[model samples]
Target: RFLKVKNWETDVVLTDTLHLKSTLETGCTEHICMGSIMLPVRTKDQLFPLAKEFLDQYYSSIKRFGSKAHMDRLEEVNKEIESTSTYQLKDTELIYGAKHAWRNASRCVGRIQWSKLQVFDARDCTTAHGMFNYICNHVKYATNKGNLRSAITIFPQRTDGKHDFRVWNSQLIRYAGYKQPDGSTLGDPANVQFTEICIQQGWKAPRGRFDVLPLLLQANGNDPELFQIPPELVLEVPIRHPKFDWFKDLGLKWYGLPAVSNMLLEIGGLEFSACPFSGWYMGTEIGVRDYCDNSRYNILEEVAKKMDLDMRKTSSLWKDQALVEINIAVLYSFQSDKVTIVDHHSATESFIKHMENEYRCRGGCPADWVWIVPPMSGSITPVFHQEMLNYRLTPSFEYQPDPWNTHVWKG
Candidate 1:
C-alpha cells in the first residue's frame, strides 16, 4: 500500500503516505487492527463468534480434503472450543492456520506454494532468550546455504489483555539503515527509524550500509533484547551488472530472503504476535523498491549518470532505462550467486497460474490487482488486466503497527 503506478514510462514513486484501506467495503465488515488498537475479541463471549467462524471453515475444509483421522481431530477441536470457556489451537490447527494465512495473504505473489509452508511451533516459548534461540534456528534453516525455503516460526499467543510476545524487527533479514551526520542515510531508508530504535535498545549498528540488523525480540513481559544474526548464516548477494563492469563499483547488496517479522498471524481468534515468516525474494522488491526508491538508496540518477543517459530531456527516458538496468543487475547477481530470486516477469506468470489453481479449488481468488502486478513492467503482466476482489479473510496475515510505536514489552 505504499506505492501506485501511473504509466510504465514514468518513474514509480512512493505515495506521500501509505494507504491501507481497500476499495470494497461490502464484505465481512473489514477489521483494520493496528498495534494497541485491539481486535474486539478479548473475552470468551466476544471471541466465540470469530473463533466459531474460523473453526467452521477449518472443519469444512478438512471434511472435504483431509483424511478421516484429520477430520475427527477437527471435530474434536470444534467441540472442545464450543464446550469449554478457554480456547487453544492444536498443533494440527496451528500448522494449517499458518499455511492458510499465506494462502489468504493478498499482497504475496508467491502464495501458489502456500501448502508447502513449513510451520515451526514455538508456542511453549515463554522467555525472550528462548525466542532468540528459535529465531536463529529459523534463519539457519530457511537460509539453507543459499537455497531458501518458505517457513514460519510461531511463538506464544497473547493472553488476558497482555501481549505475551512480539518480534520487534520488521524483518529477520534487512540491512541496517544508519543516518549520517549530514542528514543522509547509508542503507535501507525504510529501516532507518527501526535501526535507530535497535541502537537505543542496545544493539551496536555498524557504520556500513550493508550491515544486517539483529533480531529484536521480547517474551514473558520482559524488555526487548537484541541478538545479532550470525554472519555465516546470512547469505547476501553483491549486486553487479551482467554487461557493465563499472556497475560493481556501486557496491550494492541485499539479503537473500525476505522474512517478515512484525505481522500478526491470527488463527481461530488467537493472534500470534511473534510469528516471523519468510519466502525467497522477488528481485524487483530489492532492485526497484529498496534500491531505486527516492527515499531509499536513490540510485536512479547515479545509475543514469553511469549509463551516460541524458537527464536534461524528459524524452530521453533516462529514469526508465536506469530502472530496468538496475533490476537486470539485481536478477543477474542473484542468479550468478546461485541464490533463489524470481524475476518480476516470471513471478507474475506464476501468480497467474496460482490464480487459476485457487479458482479451481475455491470459487474465487482474492487479490489486490495493484499488488499482484509487479513494479517494473505493469501492463505486460497478465495480472495487470485481471479484475481482483478484496475481502477480509480469516486465518490471515495482517500488517500491524510498528513495535517501537506501541511500546512492545520493553522494560
Candidate 2:
C-alpha cells in the first residue's frame, strides 16, 4: 500500500468537470499529484518578471544540498524549499521564492493547488482542452513554452516533412492551434466529465486533447540466431574484375555474394564505414554493418565542408597557436570516445573557441560532448590532483572546493 503525507483533510478530490470517464475506462490511468506554487518572496502580486537574487539563492541552496555530506537530508532540504512558497505568503515575497519553490515541488510527485483555479470564459473546446492539457503535463507558470489546450492525437501523416520513416511516428508532436508569444499554451486543466462533453460538442466543437506515444523502437533484424546469409552471394565475380576485391579485403563472410554485392552497392564508399573511422570504431569493435540515410558522418561532412579547414595535419595548427597563450592541454580517451581539453590559464569563452577551432580543424568530432564515465580498471582509474598527475590527459586540478567522495578519507 502507498502512504501519503500527514494532516490533510481531503483524501481525494475529483476535478473532472470535463468528464474523462470514457478515456479512463480504456485503462489509461494518470496518478497526478497536485499542489499550489507561490510567487517568490520579493515578486509582489505582480508575477510577470522574476527577481534574479532569489533565483541565485535558490539554485545555490539546492546545489549545496545536493553536495551535502549527509545525502539523506536531501528530502528535508527539498521540503523546506517547497514549503517556503504559498499563496498566503506575501505575493511580492512569494515572487522570488516561487522560482525555487515551484521547481522543488514539481520534482516530487503530487497535485498542486493555486489560490484561484477557474475557467474565465467559455472558449473553444479544442482551445480549452489544449490550454488545460498543457497544464497537466510539464511545469506550470514557470515556463511558457507549450500549448496545453490543443488536442493530443496520433496522426498517420506527419505534420511536416514527407518521410514515412517509422521513427518519425513517435517523434512528431503536432500543435497547430494558437500558441502564446513565448510558445506556451494557455493553462487549462480539465475535470473528469470534460471527455464526454467533447463527443457531444463534435470535432469542431472545441480543441480536443491527446498525447502520442513518444517512444519509437525497431526490433526487426535484431536477433542474430535465426538469420542466415547464403554462401554463394557474389560481391564481385572474382574471375572478372579482380582488382575490385572489396569483399576479400574487408573480412566479410558471405553467402550468395551477389545479394551481398547488392547490399554493398547501397553501402559503397559514400558511407563513413569502419574504413574512415577504423581508428576509433575498430578499437571499440563498433563495426559498421549498415549506413542509414542520415549518418553522423554525412552531417559532419556537409556542415564542416563549409567551415574551410586546412586538414594537412592531425589537428588544427592555427588553434594550437592560439591556445598556446591559454596553456590548453588536450587528452583523447578512446575507450570513452572523449577528448578532454582543459584551459589552464583563462576562463574566458574564447578558451572554448580555441578548443573548438583546433578540434574541428584537426578533423576531430564536434564539441557536443557528454560526461565520459571512465572504465574502472583496477588501480588505473585516473586520479585528480593539483601538480603532476601520474597519468596522461587526466585533470589535475579540482574545480570544486568540497572533497569529492568522503570514502577517500584516510583512516
Candidate 3:
C-alpha cells in the first residue's frame, strides 16, 4: 500500500505499508532523514527549508535592528548561496546563528540569556585531534572558574557535495557505564553502548561508578577516534543534602555543566554536526531525570527508603517526597559548592520572562509545554498553566543520527 504523506516541502509516497500505520500512532509531523535507507517510520520533513527562512529572518533582524552595513554583506552572501548552492556565513553571522539556534531550541528552559552565548568558530578543524583540542578549550572556557558561561564550539559544516564532520559523544562530559559479570551496570546506564565503543577504540576504561567517558570524534566520514578529557578540566559537584548528613556517604556526584555534543547545528541549510553547546543545568534535569529515571540512576526507591516513607502504599506519595528531597539536595549542593545551577522555580520564572521578552521582540515564542514544565512541582510553576506551541524553527539545533548507528560506522 502507498499513500502521499504530506511533509514540509513536498508530498512523497511512503511505500512501506507498516510505516504509515506507525506514523499515525506517533502523530509526529517532522521526519529527519537518516542516511541512504530512508527510515520510513521516522523522518523529519524539510528541515532545510525552515533553516533557510530563519537565515533570511536573521539577516533582516540584524540589518533593521543592529547593523545596516551587515545587510550589504548578506546580499553578497545570498547571491553566493544561489550561485554555489552552499551558504558560507561570516564570523558575525555565525555568532548570531549560534545564539538564535539556542533561542529557537524548544526544550531548553534556560534560554532567557540565549543571546549571551559564546560561539567558538572551529570550522577549520579537520582532524579528530584538532576537534579534541577545541573541545578541551570549550570545556575550560565554559567552566569559567566555576561560574559556567554558556558556550558552543562549532565545527565544519556538511555541504551537499562533501561528507560531514561529527562528534559521536552525546555530551562533552558523561559517565561511563560498564556491564559487569552479573549484568549490573556500574555507572550511568544510558552510556553503556557508547562506553563499549570507546573501549573498543583503544581507550582504557577505568571500571568505576563515575568514570568520565572519553570524547569520540569523527571527521568527514572517517572512523571515530577517542580522546579522554583531562581530569582537571571537568568540574564535578559532590552531591550532599543540607539536612541529611548521611547523603554525602551515598557518593553521588554529577558534572557541573551539561554540554550536549551530538546535536547538529543547522544554519541556512548547512548542518554542522560537531557543534557542541552547553548551558548551566536546572537542578531537576539532574536530580529528577538523570538520577531518578529508571534506566539511569534509578535511585527513587533508595531515596524513599532513606527518607523513611511508606513505599508499600500507592497513595502515600513516597516517590514525590523523595524527588523533592533529591532536587533540594542537588540545589543546596550546587549553591554551597558555588557551582552554577538553577532551581526549578527560578528556571521556570526565567522562562516566563523569556516568553514575555520574545513576545515583545518577535511576536511569538515557539515553546513545548511538556519540556518547559520541570519534572518536580509541575503544577506550581507558571509555565505549567501557560499553553505553548511546538513548531519547526530554523537557525536551530537538531537531533541527528548517532555516528555508530550511521552507515559509515555500521561495521
Candidate 3: what lDDT? Answer: 0.78
| lDDT by residue (tens digit), candidate 2, 46-143 | 22112222323334544543344324333343343346421122232233232222112211111022112221111121232232233222112211
lDDT of 3 by residue, 75-183 (tens): 6656666576565777877898898888877778988989899999998898989999999999999998789899999998876423678888899999999988998
Model 1, position 335, has a per-residue lDDT of 91
Query: Model 1: which ten-residue window has the lowest total lDDT?
Result: 13-22
lDDT of each: 0.78, 0.19, 0.78
Give the worst 10-residue stretch by lDDT in candidate 2: 259-268
Residue pairs with colliding backbones in model 3 are 30-44, 31-43, 31-44, 31-45, 32-43, 32-44
Q: Which candidate number maximizes TM-score?
A: 1
TM-score of 3: 0.85
Off by over 4 Å in 1: 1-41, 64-85, 408-410
Model 1 agreement with the true structure over 1-411: per-residue lDDT tens digits: 333322233332222111232222322333742322223126667566666567667767777446675556556656665677547887878998999889878778998888999999998897888988898899888888888888999998877535558888888888888888998888788888888888888887776878898888878656788888788888888899999999999988888978989888988778788899999999899999988889989999999999999999978989999999999999999999989899888888898778766655765556666567788788877677665554456688876766666664434
**What TM-score does candidate 2 get on C-alpha atoms?**
0.16
Task: Give residue 389's lDDT in candidate 1 (0 to 100).
Answer: 59
